[PDB]
Structures are given as C-alpha cells and as structure tokens.
C-alpha cells in the first residue's frame, strides 16, 4: 500500500505532551496490527543533543544504532515495538549542516540555495527516509505553531501533504484549553487563534487534540469545531491523567483511531488494548510499597532521569510494588552527610558527567554497601561504586576517575588511552554509543536476572574501568559480573557480601518498557521490597 | 491640561477581569488626587443591555442618569467616586445605530459610508465625549484581540493615539500566563502571540498586565519584555487574589501608577490607599459569621445579582461580620416547601421580571415575616412582601401583580395606568430608570439608617404599589416608610412587630461601595448577626 | 558619538531596488560629511555567492579583501567612498555555518542552541562588527517581509532597536504602490497590508519608501500615513527614474536626510549633491553616440554583467559619448557567424567560466583584431584574445585553455600547477581573489591610460596565461602590458598593430564609479568614438 503520514503539531504552548500523545496514538494503531513508526523533528540548531546538558532539555536518549536523540524517542520505544534509529530524530542543525555540506561541494550546480526549495526538500527527504515502508508514520513537529523556529518544518509538511495527496496525509494539532478558576470554565479562544495561525502558514488541521486539566465538554468541542473547519468528531479531549498508559484507551474511546483508519482507507480490526489495560491494572493493584532514593547531580530537572524514573515504575509493575521515588541531590550528601539517606529501601545512582556532586555519590555508594541497602549504579553510578570499593575496601587512598582528578595515584576509572597503574606504568572513538553485546559471568546476580549468557544494552560513556588496577580490587572481593569486546572492558560489577548490589556501565533504563519491564530493575525493586520487610 | 487616555485591551481569553483591573488602576490614580474616569466599549450588537436577560448577560447596571449599562460600570463606581453616565458605556449596536440614522437622514451628503472613517469617527467622538475634562481616561475595549468583533474599536483607538499624540496615550494589554502542572512552569507563549496579534492590527502595547493563578516571576516577565518591545518594569503581574480590593495595592507595589504618571508627565503625590488597606483589613478580620439566603429566579448565574452580592459583602465589612451568601432557587420553595429556608440568619429577595418562581418568593417573604427572620426585599422583593402581607394579614385572597395575574381581584401591584380596586373602580412613560429623590417617613427604620428627610436611589421598574388598595394594607398594620413624586408612589414598606423587615422599590445595591458601605445593607447584616446570636 | 542604524526592509515584492535606495540615501548622508556604511544581509543558504552561477542572481561582486559578495555591494561602492569588505555582506548560510561550528566544539556549554537567542545573537554580532565606528550604518535586509527566509534577520534587528535605543535606530520599509491602468490610480492597499505584516513580526516602520512607476501623490501618501502610524513627511515617493544617479536628489527633495538627521540628533550641513548633479548633466549632454557590442554567454540575464554595463556608461560620461550597449550571445556567433558583429564601434568580451559559447568569443576576438574594431577583454575576454592570437597569428593550431580542452597540445591558458609546453615538458589556493598590485610595462597603451607604473585591480580567476608557451606568442607580436607577483603572471596583453586592443585578467569594472570613471573604460569608449568617426 501507499505509506500514510500524520503530521503532529502543537499550538498555544509547549509542554503539551505531544510526544506522549503521538506515542499513545501509535500504540492504538499498532494494536490494530498496523506497521507504525514515529519521528521527531526538533527546531534546535544542535546537530544532535550529544553536546546538550542533561539539566537543559532533559535526558539524552540513545537508540540501538548509537544515535543521541531527544528523550521523546524513549516514549516512542515504551509505546510501540518498532525500534528507533538515527532516522526517527533530526534537528534544524542537521538539515542546515547537510544542505551547507552539499552547497560548499557544488551539488546545487551554481543555484541560489533557498529555505524553499532546498531546506524544505532536505526535510521532506528525511521524513520519507524514516517513513516509507510503514502503514502509518507519525511526524511530530517540535516548537509551537506561530514561532519562527518551526516554519521550515511546517512549510515542508504542507508541501508533502499536496504531493503525496490528502488521501494519505492528516494534520493533527494539539492545543491548550486552559481552565479559568475565576469563571469556572475551560477556554477555546487559544485553540481558535492557534488554528488561524496554523492556517496562515497554509495548513488546515484535520484533527484537534485539546489538552486540559479536565475533559473538554461537548459544548466547547462543538465551538472549536464550528470556528476551525474541523468535524466535531475530530475534536478530541486529552485531559491530564495520573498515568500516561491510560492515554491510548482515552483516545480510542473517542474514536480517534477509527477516524484515522477511515481517512486512510485502512481495513484493520478494532484495537486490542489488553496489554495497556494490564499495565494499568498492575499499577492500580500493588501489594506493598517501597521508597527508593535516586541520588544524582541533575535532580533540579527530573526529566534528566526520564527513562530511569519510568524503569523504576516498571520494576514496581512486575513485583506489584508501589515505588516512591525520592530525588536526592548528591551535593546535599557532601554538605549534610548520610543523615538524608535514612528511610530508603534502596538507592539508585544514575549516569552523569563532571566532578560536581560525585564525592556525594561515592559516600552514597559507601552507605548502601556498608548498611546492606539494595544499590543499583548506572554508568557514573558504577564508577562511584568502583571508587568506593577501591578506596574503603582495597585501601587505594584517593582512588578516582581521570575525568575528575586527572593526576590521581589510583585512576580506577580512565579513558583506555590513559590507562596506567599506581607507579605510572602503562600497557604495550573512545566514546561507546548504542547496542553492545555483553558477556555475563556464571554465578553472578545479573547472569541469573537476565537468565542468558549474553545481553544487549546501550552505552553512552568514554570513561572505562582501568584493567591495570582492577585485579587489586578483585583480590579485595569485588566481582566482575559482565565484560564486552576485545579489550575485555568491565560492563557490570557486584559486591557479593550484600543482598543486592549491582552497577553497570550501560543504560538499562533505555531497554525497559512498561509492558516487558526489565530484568535488572525488576530484581532491584524486588530487593527493595525484601529490605523494607526485614525492617 | 491635555486629557490622557489609557486604552485597555484583552488577549488570549476573555474573563480576565479587565474591568476590575481598569477600575483598580483608576482607584490608584484617584488616590494620587487625579480626576479620572473609565468607559466600557462593548462589541455586542444590542443597542444597550435594556433587553438582555439576567440569566445570559448578568445584572443590568443603572447609572444616576438612568442609563441601562454593562455590569462593569458597577465595578467602576465601587472603585472610584467619579459618577458613571450613558457616556461611560456604548456598544457596536449604538455606534451602527448612530451612523445608520445620520446616513438615512443625509448627514454624509451622498458619501459612501465606510467602517473607516465613518464607524471609527463615531467611536472616537463617543470616547472624546466621555473622556475630555479628565486628567486620565481608562477606555476598556471589550472582546479579545484576534477576534472580528473588536476590530473597529481597535482601529479607532489606534487612530486616536496618533491624532492626540503618544505623549497623552498609552496601550495597556491584559493577557493570560497559564500554569502547566506537568512542567510546573507558567507560560509566556500566549502573551508573545497575543502582542503580535495586537501589533498586526497596528497597536504596540506600552504596558502588559499578566493575569495568572500565581505571580509571574522575573525571568518570565523579562522574557515577555524581550519579545514584546515592552520595558521589563512595564510588564505587571496581576495574580488571582481572594479579594479584588487587594488589586490597587498589588499594582501600586509594582510601580504601575508611577510608570503612567511619568509617561503622562503628571506630578502628583504618592497614592494614599489607606481606605483600601482598611477594606482589606475589615474583610480578613470578621468577629462573627451569618448565613443570608438570597431567594431569586436567576441564581443559575450569580452575576445576575453582582451588585447585590457585593452590597451584602460591604454590609459585612461595616459590622465586621463574614456573610455566607446561600443562593436559593425560588422555584425550589414552590416544589419542596419552606424547609430549604431553615438555617438562614436573614433572607434577601432581589429584583426580577416574569411570574416564574414568584410564588416561591411570596412564600419566602411569608416565612421571613412569620418566623421573625430579617428580610430585605428589592423591587420584586418588595412586590412579594406587599403581596404576602395583602394575602395573609389584610385577608386579600390571591392578591397579586397585574404583571403575573392581569385580571386578579386585588392588583396590589400594577402599572399607574392599570390602578383599580377589588370592584374594578378606577381614579377620575411607565418605566422608572435612574436617580429619584425619595422622601422618608419620620420614626421609620429607614429614616434612622439614612439620617435624612430625602435620599437619592436608582430605579429600574414599571409595576408600582396600587395606591387604591394601599390604605386597606396600611389598616392591617403595614407601614409606608418612603414615597416619591406627585403620584406619591410607595418606595419603601416596613413590617413593625419584626426585628428588621424592609423592602424598597429602588436598587440600593447600585449605591453600595466597599469604602462607604450602604445604610440599608449595613442595617440588614447587623440584624442578621443579632438574629444569629438569639438562636 | 553612538553609531546610528537604519534597518532597510522590503514589502509586497522583491526587485524594488532596495540596494540602490539604501546606496542613494547613503550618498546624501556622505554629502553631509557623515561617516556612513551599508551592509547586505542575504537570506540565501549559500555561505557566499562564490559557488553561485552568474545566470541565477547576477554578477558575483569582489571586494578589495577578496570577498565574493552580492552585486548590491557594487551599487554601494558606486554611491559612497567607504570601501566594502567581507563584513558588509553575509548570508543565513554564513550565520548557521558559524553557530554550527561553535556548537560542535562546545562554545555553548551544553545549552540548547536556538534561533533565539543563538542565531539572532550571531546576526547582531555581525551587524555591530560591520557598523560600529560609523555615524550611520544602513542595514539592508534581503527577502520580503512576510516570507519565512528573512524572519531571523527581522527578529535580530527588532532586538537591536530595543537594546541600542530608538534614539539611535530607524526602520525604513520599501513597498510597491502599483498603478492599475483600468482604474487610473496607484494602490496603497499592498503598503497597508505589508506594514501590518512587518508589525506582526514586532517592527513599527518609521519611514515608508513607496516604489511606483510614477510619483505617489499627496492623497495616497496621507492615506498610507493614516493606516501605518507613520508621519506624512516620513512617507517618501521613489518613482521609476531613467537614471539611478537622480535618486539621491529625489530623496533629498522630500527631506528624507533631514528627517534621519533630526531623529539621530546629527547636526551636519545641507547635502551638497554637486557631484551627482554633474554625473546627471554629463549623461544628459553627450556630443556623439557609439554602439558597443558586449559578446558573452550570460546575456539572457543582463545583471550577470551589472558592473561592466555601468563601467561602459561611466566610460561614456567621461567622453560625453552616449553608449548604446548591444548584448550579443557568443553562441549566435558560432551559429550565424560574424554577420551579427556588424555595425559595432567596439566589442567587449566579459568574464565567464565553462566552454559553452567560448569559440564564439575567440571568433569575436579574431573579428575585432582583423577588422581593427576597438576590443576590451576581461578575464575570459583576455583568454579568448590570447587563444585567438596563439591560433591565427602564432600558428598554434587548436590552442586552448585546460578549463575547456584539458589535453590540448597548446594550453596557452592553464592552472599554474598544470603549466606544460607543446611536447608535455614542465617547470622545476590557485584562485586569485581581490586587490592585487599589477606592474604596467613602459610604452604600453594601459601604462599611459592608468598614468602610473603600478595599479591595484581585483581578480576572480584560477586559469592563468601559460608562461611556458607565452614567449612564442610574444615572438608572433603579442605585447605583455602588465604582470604581477613572484610567478610574473600575465595581467594585461595588447595587440599593438590595432588602434585599441586591450585585455586584462582582473575585473576593472569593480573599481569604476560614475563620479571617478575608470582609465581603461574611458580609453575604450574614446577609441569607440574615434572608430565611429572614421566610418
Ligand atoms: N473569530 C471570532 C470568533 C468569535 N468572535 C466573538 O467572540 C465573542 C465571544 O467571546 P468569548 O466568550 O471570549 O469567546 P468564545 O468563542 O466563547 O471562547 P471561550 O471558549 O474562550 O470562552 C462573540 O461575541 C463573537 F462575536 F463570536 C469574534 O468576534 N471573532
Ligand atoms: N518568535 C519566536 C519566539 C521564540 N521562538 C523559539 O521558542 C523556543 C522556546 O520555546 P518555548 O520554550 O515553548 O517558549 P518560551 O518563549 O520560553 O515561552 P514559555 O514561557 O511559554 O515557555 C526557542 O527555541 C526559540 F527559538 F526562541 C521562536 O522560534 N520564535
Ligand atoms: N484596515 C482597513 C483599511 C481600510 N478598510 C476599508 O477599505 C475600504 C476602501 O477600500 P479600497 O478603496 O480598496 O482601499 P484604500 O484604502 O483606498 O486603498 P487603495 O489605495 O489601494 O485604493 C474602506 O471602505 C474601508 F472601510 F476603510 C478596512 O476595512 N480595513
Ligand atoms: N496526559 C498527560 N497528563 C499529564 N502529564 C502529561 C500528559 N502528557 C504528557 N504529560 C507531561 O507533560 C510534560 C510535557 O511534555 P513534552 O514532551 O515536553 O511536551 P511537548 O512535546 O509539547 O514539548 C512531560 O512531563 C509529560 O510527561
Ligand atoms: N485578580 C483577580 N483574582 C481573582 N478573581 C478575579 C480577579 N480579577 C477578576 N476576577 C474575577 O474574574 C471574573 C472576571 O470576569 P470579567 O470581568 O467578565 O472579565 P473581563 O474583564 O475580561 O471582561 C469575575 O468573576 C471577577 O470577580
Ligand atoms: N528608481 C529605480 N528606477 C528604475 N529601476 C530601478 C530603480 N531602483 C532600482 N531599479 C532596478 O530595479 C531592479 C531590482 O533591484 P534589486 O536590487 O533586485 O531589488 P531588491 O533589492 O528589492 O531585490 C534592478 O535592475 C535595479 O537596477
Ligand atoms: Na465564551
Ligand atoms: Na519555555
Ligand atoms: Na481606494
């Protein structure tokens, strides 16, 4: 058949939850047996978010192919089984970089290179590249209709709709319908004005998704329909929900997938949302409760840890354990000591870069190891666990990473090219990104949990365990639970004189889903439940 | 010398409280000794609110000169001591009516009559007529910037700004800065887009008033300033408040009146808000509480009783009593009996037209008279009090108004022209609107409260007390407390053998203010608390 | 003093003559003794027009510093004596290239890189770099207000106006006021709508320049003023003129420079336009007439030869000779023979790249040399003259450039790195751009005309005269009139058995002005006049 496109735009404000709405609609369509994908067009000038700081736009998501992407691709993978790659996310920066490359080396044959057709052509080419082969492609346009930054994306998708044909293309626009407490009604005026803004760029929306802190009533939806040239049945209410896993059900109950399947002439069975109903059921029927402390340096922006927070909740689902996630600043552990780590059933130290707040994480790893509090360390969380054990068990005073203290005597963490021992003796793309096969060691906690000899997890780090100093830490009782590659790089460590102490170099949070959970997070939350019971 | 204008527009949504914001700014400027006025330009086609239904439109406000005006002119008179007239409110309807009549007459000398200049000229003439002679004129533009209905007003004030000069004109634009729960941010984007919309009409705002459920922080105000060509100190936060009487102080604390006085080269002393400080104090520090039942036929829209609800609150301020106003549908009294009138410390029956729910009100007046529950009847509320006393004390079976039962035996309430006795015997402009001098009766409860032989109150009514049946009601012990005119029309009735029972034909709520209160409402709330003690 | 900025935008259509209007205003201000510069912001993605084809956007202008720029910088240098450089022209491509470079190497320190502030900051930095030091800086914004491509430039200059202050910044907007033949009036509606478009982006224009095929009358200018918030005196008529040299006078006669000097508080004497009055006088008072054939490959777009065409007219001014420039396709000379070169008083072969139409130019050079028709060859025009003489006089059959026939026996024109002789023997940044000192040979025609031993002219070429084959062409009677550099590269050749035959490698048209003329073009047109008289 001919691939169909749903272009998803946002009006009035950002932070509408456009990724989650697009992902939720994708989940309904996939549950009708359709081959569906999603792609994110970001109006940022960054060629990719690989440079970007976690405390700016949130977590840097990593795909299998090692692309550094917007955290929305995390939402996409948690809602649909279509695996994301580089071609599901691109920026204005990427588009201009490509056109500039082609221009400087004569591809345009002396032409004036213009926003139209050259920038718009490059956008359309990347949409087609990511989309063609699928039944339905959701194309999420970042930025707000009415702003400068999204205009080339909007002009590009306007052209695509005409070329491909309106039998194969739909415009789905999200707006804010805010509640005015003073008047006790939700307001359609921003929707009315946002639709006129979208039309002024050349796009008639086919479907309006109305974000509000409550259902948009029939009268307000009829008024939006009346002023926006949209059928009343294509005006959809997407209220604030306590669980994003409910959104597929809410959209399906308003016939959104039926409307799309009719417009695209797709003859497919009714969506079976049993898998989402199950996740909701699990969430609403916990048997016990745990408090897990996430001790990191980016807690001021929780979205810095989006996938980790979701992974912990998924750990809860599989154990019927309600997880109270307590975000704790590692700098507060440096200031106020281990007093603030009290009342925790488990401690997670997530990924990060830079020395700021790391000594707090090392102190935190110490506290969890000594007091037998279940511990999961991710990337930096593994480094601080290795440093902790190197210093306080293997008696390597001031043991550190070359990232933090370049000239330290015991660089137990360092770049492969920097590897040295305590006497400064040496051996005879440092950045690891995306899916890597990891060999699990027999009689390791993780080799049981994963229940396989080999696993595939995703990396985003350059600072490795120093193999030259590892043997001394192994003598002192630290277990290597996982390795990878020719250089036998350390992937997982365990402290076996402890009910549950695991730390990995990879980001297991990136392969966790609400439906399939994750062996490591399920095990971590189980251990948290067991600890809570023993108190 | 030269009259200054502040044009006040609204963006994003209506229900911003633009009239209250304008009235609040006018209160600060009046408190600096300036001669200030406010006018409301309504984009509705109704020539005036005279026809409009309370349930749909809200209360019809009446000025001294007997103009039927927008509810907002009530806010104006409650915030400043400048008296409103016909000149302070006009509609699109009034403007097109003016121009159509000039055209049909032949004033335009066979010219093509156009939105510009003819409609815009008619708007500017009415603004100048209302404004000139004042130091500062606040011109509130109804409707939302971006809608069709306000465009002629916006083009008119754009022209006025250029003609009069920008040394004497400012544009003050209200927007919504909504809060997004999921991001914990207030959003400037709607303000950004609304200012571009206002610019697209030809108006650069000078001052932005940011309505939000919370204070708009410095970063958000700075961002608005950056995108809107507005100095940061001219971006004002007008958060949701528990009392509108706080708004003058909140605007003063942000230097709004200083900015305006500087722009207009007005050298005047600092605003003395001591009277508003007293009002805010009184409201926050009630010594006792009362429940007053307002029994009417429009309670489905409380704004139908805007000035009555405010007058009750002001009654509370003067006696240091918190007033819990219970809105009771008079038809529920017809249906479920007088049981729904229990737990009331006082009963108010306000104005209204048409028979629907009136029998419930008559029964309510009976219940209040027989159980010694304090009673204030306003217009219809007086009619039902006379009808009650006529029926159940003066033994006039089925005594009614000709408005409701035209051919009733005892029309104790009827038009002056319709006046007849029980046998059908007669004596050998009916609508009363605006200020009327009323003579009070010596030793009456109202002669006391008002402390004058003559008072001025405002009428909006047609149906009078039938003087041919009055003497019979007087014999049964009803006291006439006030009269007016050559026709000796009954203005106020009292029931002696009652702690507090007053009913008046005029609307005393239209002369009540938070600062000076109202003798009648002060008396009524005083009686309500005295009753509440005796229980 | 503080540098003042005039931001010059275009509305309704492109091809308004915005460069010439900005240049003409600059000429008035310079004639008031002000230090004035102009810069062009082009919304094209090309990093520069160095790649761009002549038959797309017109001639590639070259500044002294060797920057390849928009032809508008040619207008700037012909109207003001402030010499242009790289910093007087930049593109969107250049801006994005710079921001992308900075981003990929961590200058933004993990920030999200955005159109605002990062793209707008980069634009503002380049405006300040090109402007600061001058009294008045004219900033010409390419593209049309209302289009996507100019929005970042427009947002950038909006920010600059607020930051620098409106005491130092003016917005000057050009619009089309088209004539409707059917109704016999010029139309202000496009101006009205274009101004609202500009305002919707956040810019209130201060000055409106109305382009029309006739003066915009007082009534139409008053109507524009009324609807656009612009004083009537700041609405300027810029009609179509027969000579662009008249434009400074037309703008001065409407008080435009007075208005600018008042807004910027610049106390300077009345503009003395004597130099422009002289150019106009010369143009209007020729003594004789000549027809000069320009034989090239880009004649379908005359703007491909903008500076050459102006240089020929300037040649006319200095001789009081009216020059009829006949554009002749060199491919028509290949097809139809030298029949179409009849009735020419002189022949100019301008610059170009690619073999298409070159054999026609060689044939043309032959015709001019043999029939004693005055000849000027520029760059390619010199190559074809050398080829002509090499082939038909020095008996080097099929003598050619390596650009056209790489493997030819006699590459008399070739890259320095390709230099070889007829037997394939060799010697024991190829691109030359911008100002180069050239040594003129004693007893050469050019050493007289330039009347100096050394001259500075501007290059844009890589294909040089082959020194290894030159001596043989010199033996055959060709004179080398000019050389440059260590490699003694041939800059000028002459055929001395001819009244006037000169060809240069440089682009003398780039240093020609209407006021100062050019020694070489003056001499060329003189020779054309002398030839015309001899017939
Ligand atoms: N394009 C338009 C649309 C409407 N209106 C005018 O808009 C007016 C109503 O204004 P409101 O009550 O603020 O708007 P609402 O649409 O009900 O939106 P909300 O859901 O935010 O309350 C009518 O007089 C009108 F006349 F209908 C207008 O003038 N031009
Ligand atoms: N005219 C404009 C203005 C801004 N932006 C772009 O707007 C983007 C930021 O979008 P956000 O975070 O949703 O907007 P905010 O302005 O912070 O407003 P809020 O207070 O509602 O959050 C930048 O990349 C940009 F580039 F700055 C734009 O493209 N065109
Ligand atoms: N913003 C505006 C401006 C004007 N008009 C209306 O525009 C109408 C006149 O239309 P025309 O004759 O085509 O316009 P012109 O301005 O004279 O421009 P041109 O110079 O191109 O002829 C009036 O009825 C109006 F009413 F004045 C309008 O409705 N809204
Ligand atoms: N239905 C919903 N109810 C509550 N929060 C939601 C909902 N959908 C999304 N969110 C949250 O809203 C926030 C904003 O989402 P984001 O992806 O930044 O929006 P946008 O794509 O429009 O910029 C996120 O924290 C997201 O989890
Ligand atoms: N600052 C404020 N805080 C709380 N409520 C407010 C505030 N300002 C106004 N209100 C309330 O909000 C409503 C304003 O609606 P309205 O005056 O009709 O809107 P507009 O002035 O935009 O036409 C009223 O119910 C008023 O009491
Ligand atoms: N006053 C004028 N009269 C006639 N032609 C003019 C005038 N001003 C400019 N032109 C011509 O108009 C054409 C368009 O100029 P151009 O620089 O392309 O405009 P823009 O900068 O708006 O794109 C050029 O050929 C230019 O020489
Ligand atoms: Na409404
Ligand atoms: Na923002
Ligand atoms: Na007209």
UniProtKB/Swiss-Prot annotation, chains A, B, C:
Keyword annotations from UniProtKB, A to Z: ATP-binding, Glutamine amidotransferase, Ligase, Magnesium, Metal-binding, Nucleotide-binding, Pyrimidine biosynthesis
Domain Glutamine amidotransferase type-1: 291-534
Active site: 379 (nucleophile), 507, 509
Name by which UniProt lists this protein: CTP synthase
A Pfam family: CTP_synth_N
Species this protein is from: Escherichia coli O45:K1 (strain S88 / ExPEC)
Binding site for ATP: 15-20, 72, 239-241
Pathway entry: Pyrimidine metabolism; CTP biosynthesis via de novo pathway; CTP from UDP: step 2/2
An MF annotation (GO) of this entry: ATP binding
Activity modulation comment: Allosterically activated by GTP, when glutamine is the substrate; GTP has no effect on the reaction when ammonia is the substrate. The allosteric effector GTP functions by stabilizing the protein conformation that binds the tetrahedral intermediate(s) formed during glutamine hydrolysis. Inhibited by the product CTP, via allosteric rather than competitive inhibition.
Subunit structure, interactors included: Homotetramer.
Family to which the UniProt record says this protein belongs: Belongs to the CTP synthase family.
Top-level taxon of the source organism: Bacteria
Source taxonomy: Bacteria, Pseudomonadati, Pseudomonadota, Gammaproteobacteria, Enterobacterales
